[PDB]
Design an enzyme around this catalytic site. Structure first.
Site, PDB file in Angstrom:
ATOM      1  N   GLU A  59       0.844  -1.184   0.000  1.00  0.00           N
ATOM      2  CA  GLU A  59       0.000   0.000   0.000  1.00  0.00           C
ATOM      3  C   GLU A  59       0.884   1.240   0.000  1.00  0.00           C
ATOM      4  OE1 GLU A  59      -1.705   2.348   3.013  1.00  0.00           O
ATOM      5  OE2 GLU A  59      -3.529   1.114   3.038  1.00  0.00           O
ATOM      6  N   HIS A  60       1.987   1.169   0.728  1.00  0.00           N
ATOM      7  CA  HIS A  60       2.916   2.284   0.815  1.00  0.00           C
ATOM      8  C   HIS A  60       3.690   2.579  -0.466  1.00  0.00           C
ATOM      9  CE1 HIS A  60       3.296   3.924   4.942  1.00  0.00           C
ATOM     10  NE2 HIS A  60       2.586   2.849   5.236  1.00  0.00           N
ATOM     11  N   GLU A 136       4.951   5.191  11.323  1.00  0.00           N
ATOM     12  CA  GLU A 136       3.516   5.133  11.458  1.00  0.00           C
ATOM     13  C   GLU A 136       3.121   4.208  12.614  1.00  0.00           C
ATOM     14  OE1 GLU A 136       1.932   4.127   7.612  1.00  0.00           O
ATOM     15  OE2 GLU A 136       2.398   6.173   6.923  1.00  0.00           O
TER      16      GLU A 136
END
Lengths: 443, 54
Positions: A59-60, A136
């Protein structure tokens, strides 16, 4: 113009399957702007002990550019057309979607397809997003509400695939490889498990055409076009208590096992949570709120907030509640809460459900407030229900629920069941699973 | 831990564990502990051989 009619008059959701198995769906409105995206049947659940977190690492990088058009270019090309690119990943569902003018519906579709099919995975980018993700995690570690739900799963599905965090282990993120990531994509992102959904001022045909054009990659073997069924996740009545008197408030989540997407009861279950509802110190209704729990919460300063939930999954789910309170009001809060669950099972009123329903109806309708939300509903119903359930239908299913029915279901899922519970913070006053277990029976 | 059920239960168990020997005695060997000299009405003109308390 009656609600009844306004529902019937809602345009239909077109669904066509390509040859490679991909399904294209969309709801056309008179809107100049739109939202198109691919909703995937992948996620941490589909991961394993060694690649847990890949889907997130992916996703990153999904946006950090593809092979045909690297980072700088990819970014520049999207920004310059005023399109918004967003996406996410949960335990059983991942998705990337774009918000732009209908006019660019096709150029968008192209972009999407280029992202899911040709992610760069530039060796140099990885090592950077690795430091980023690592950051994160530390920020999310300070969000008690998600630290709690994670723990909830961690134990409610302990020892299984569902017991894993979507973001993943620290090690896993420190060592995952260009390979593992590549592998994840090539193993999971596949047509039969994907859905190109869209909503706004788009022509299904213009869409499906642009679809056949960029989503090619045809499969050869039979393995490639059958959707793999996941091994089941076992629920376990248990508790996990992460204590830290240093935190200002305590978080508690309690749940029994849910039925799973396909099951109809889910409707009644939602109708139920509609009764208990939710609270939060900024609701002005205060002591007059209709939700008994909310009232008590107010009458006795029982908590800062609380929410009921019915988190569903393919083959299972979590039906419970969560609340934040001060160290010395945890018990009363919990006590009252479990009380309401008991009320549901033994003494619900027609008056209660009648309202719960209207609250629920308004809810489903609001879930489709814009294009992104609609697209998100289409991308999901297909992926989960295998088709689209129109408000017209939902409403009929909701209108059929009556007290006698809410009772039976809640009883069936809550009464005398061993629950899974997760507590975080200054939880000393909340205590003993045993005691909590007995709050699971007798009004 | 909350007394109940942990100790309410633990004590009710310890109650039956001891109560058994008590009853076993009280019912099978009733006078196992009592002086037979007390089956003789008090008599101020006969000192028993060995006067001792319980």
């Amino acid at each position: 113009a009656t609600y009844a009619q306004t529902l019937q008059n809602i345009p239909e959701t077109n669904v066509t399957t390509l040859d490679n198995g991909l399904r294209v769906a969309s709801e056309e409105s008179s809107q100049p702007t739109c939202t198109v995206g691919v909703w995937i049947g992948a996620g941490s659940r589909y991961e394993n002990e060694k690649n847990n977190g890949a889907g997130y690492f992916v996703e990153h990088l999904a946006f950090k550019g593809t092979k045909k058009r690297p980072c700088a270019a990819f970014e520049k090309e999207v920004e310059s057309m005023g399109a918004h690119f967003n996406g996410y990943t949960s335990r059983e569902q991942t998705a990337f979607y774009i918000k732009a003018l209908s006019k660019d519906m096709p150029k968008v579709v192209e972009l999407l397809a280029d992202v899911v099919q040709n992610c760069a995975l530039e060796e140099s980018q990885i090592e950077k997003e690795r430091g980023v993700i690592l950051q994160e995690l530390k920020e999310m570690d300070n969000d008690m509400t998600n630290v709690t739900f994670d723990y909830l799963h961690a134990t409610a599905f302990q020892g299984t695939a569902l017991a894993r965090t979507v973001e993943g282990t620290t090690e896993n993120i420190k060592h995952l490889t260009r390979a593992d990531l590549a592998s994840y994509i090539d193993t999971h992102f596949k047509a039969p498990r994907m859905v190109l959904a869209a909503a706004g001022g788009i022509s299904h045909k213009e869409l499906v055409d642009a679809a056949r054009q960029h989503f090619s990659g045809v499969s050869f073997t039979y393995k490639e076009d059958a959707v793999p069924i996941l091994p089941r996740c076992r629920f376990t009545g248990s508790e996990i208590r992460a204590r830290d008197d240093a935190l200002p408030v305590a978080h508690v989540a309690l749940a029994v096992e849910g039925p799973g997407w396909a099951d109809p009861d889910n409707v009644v279950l939602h109708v139920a949570n509609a009764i208990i509802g939710r609270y939060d110190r900024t609701f002005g209704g205060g002591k007059h709120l209709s939700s008994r729990l909310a009232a008590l919460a107010v009458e006795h300063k029982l908590c800062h907030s609380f929410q009921t939930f019915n988190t569903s999954y393919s083959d299972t789910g979590l039906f419970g509640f969560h609340f934040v309170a001060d160290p010395l009001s945890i018990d009363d809060m919990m006590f009252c809460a479990q009380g309401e669950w008991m009320r549901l099972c033994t003494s619900t009123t027609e008056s209660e459900v009648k309202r719960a329903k209207n609250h629920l109806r308004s809810a489903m309708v609001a879930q489709l407030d814009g294009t992104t939300p609609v697209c998100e509903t289409i991308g999901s119903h297909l992926l989960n229900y295998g088709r689209r359930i129109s408000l017209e239908e939902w409403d009929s299913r909701i209108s059929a629920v009556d007290a006698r029915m809410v009772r039976d279901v809640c009883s069936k899922y809550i009464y005398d069941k061993c629950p899974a519970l997760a507590a975080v913070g200054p939880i000393e006053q909340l205590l003993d699973y045993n005691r909590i277990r007995s709050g699971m029976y007798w009004i | 831990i909350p007394f109940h059920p942990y100790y309410s239960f633990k004590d009710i168990l310890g109650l039956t564990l001891m109560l058994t020997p008590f009853l076993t005695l009280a019912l099978f060997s009733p006078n196992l502990l009592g002086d037979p000299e007390n089956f003789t009405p008090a008599n101020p003109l006969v000192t028993p051989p060995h006067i001792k308390p319980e």
